[PDB]
């Protein structure tokens, strides 16, 4: 759906073909668009188009430009390169005051992520925004580099994480426990079907409990936890359960059990959207859980602003022996990556 935005003084209008731009690790879809100007109003002026990736935190406020690119589209510079089908269409259709622009993403950026704090959280609101801006600027004998608000337009865009071609090794885990006063172990092996999952895709967690203890494994709980780490400006940490299933089955003393439970991590699983890393405005409707942060090798993690990750957590609730006051709970975790399907 081709969408446009006109400036207040109607001098600079900007057209884009889409709002979501696909990052699939291998490459990122460039921002190809067009700018229709009113030659009467932009006469003697210059019109630029900019791409900005900013991390914001927060009145108290912090902002870091994770990436910035800018080009002049009027008057023309003559170095635009080959035009795309969308650009050619829009130019041939809108008239002659139409000037194409192409703004590429680098490979060291994160994707669109927003985070609003919950009452039990000490962190402030933060996120990563992507913004395209077309503006007209000019100088005079009294002022230079004057950019009036009326001669400019902004468009918020999305940068969406999609699965790359390859994929990590099969997620596996193994934890063993020896409790107080007994060298008898409780072993727990956990495997996932694959290392990358898609938003909405069922996640098969295979759980193998080898219980050599005199204790009873009263409960087997499997969660999908979203761990999020703000890594710029303030060191905030969040961890929320976004999916949960129990086994409805126990493991008696000196017993073994292997079962498969299927978790689907969805934002719709909890009405509470706060304290969770999302991929859009916390009140919109197509907002999903943020995709796993894919940190490219050699890059310093802090330039991602917000690190998002997902893990399967297997919790075992074991019974107390004679003399013990309460039950006990042990747990293990196995990481995995969540994102949108391949292009």
Author numbering: 11 to 68, 76 to 360
Question: Which lines from the publication concern this structure?
Answer:
The multistep process involves a rapid phosphorylation of the receptor protein followed by high affinity binding of arrestin that sterically blocks the interaction between receptor and G-protein, leading to the signal termination. Visual arrestin-1 (arr-1) is proposed to exist in basal or inactive form that gets activated upon interaction with light-activated, phosphorylated rhodopsin (P-Rh*).
Here, residues R175 and D296 form the central salt bridge in the polar core and charge reversal of these residues results in arrestins that bind to the non-phosphorylated, activated receptor. R175E crystallized in space group P212121, with one molecule per asymmetric unit. Residues 1–10 (N-terminus), 69–75 (loop V-VI or finger loop) and 361–404 (C-terminal residues including the C-tail) could not be traced in the electron density maps and thus are likely to be disordered. R175 forms a central salt bridge, restrained by D296 and D30. The hydrogen bond network in the polar core collapses in R175E, where all the hydrogen bonds with residue E175 are broken, increasing the side chain B-factor by ∼50%. Interestingly, the side chain of R29 is disordered in R175E as it could not be traced in the electron density map beyond the Cβ position. Compared to arr-1, R175E shows a 7.5° rotation. Crystallization of R175E was performed without any ligand. The structure of R175E presented here is the first structure report of an arrestin with mutation in the polar core that shows a completely disrupted hydrogen bond network in the polar core, a 7.5° rotation between N- and C- domains, and a ‘free’ C-tail.
